[PDB]
Amino acid sequence: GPLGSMKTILVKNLPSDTTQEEVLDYFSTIGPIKSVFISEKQANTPHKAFVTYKNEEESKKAQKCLNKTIFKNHTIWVGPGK
C-alpha cells in the first residue's frame, strides 16, 4: 500500500485550502477510506488528492456519485487513480 490499483481514486480541482479531514469526511459517505494524500501545490491553484477506499467497489461508486459534484465551490473531477 497505501494505494490500490482499483481502490484509489484521483480527485482533481480541489480548492487549495482543502484539508485531509475535509476530503475524508466528504468521500467517506460512500464507504470507508484507508488513506488520503493531497498534492502539495501553491495556494489559490487547483489541488489534487489520492483517496484510497478499503473496498474496490466503493471506489467505483465514488467515481459515479461524486464526479462533477460541488465541493467548496469547485466542481470536482473524480476518476481512477490507477
Q: Contact residues for Na ion (CB under 5 A)?
A: 39-40
49 Cβ contact list (under 8 Å, min separation 6):
10, 11, 14, 18, 20, 23, 36, 37, 38, 39
Q: Which is nearer to Na ion, 41 or 72 (CB)?
A: 41
Whichever of 16 and 69 has its CB closer to Na ion, that residue is 16
The three-state DSSP-derived secondary structure of 43-60 is CCCCEEEEEEECCHHHHH
* Smallest separation, CB 40 to Na ion (Å): 5
Query: Which residue carries 488528492 as its cell?
Result: 49
Shortest separation between residue 39's beta carbon and Na ion, angstroms: 4
Residue 31: DSSP 8-state: S
Closer to Na ion by Cβ: residue 30 or 38 = 38
CB of 70 to Na ion, least distance (A): 24
Q: Which residue's beta carbon is nearest to the bound Na ion?
A: 39
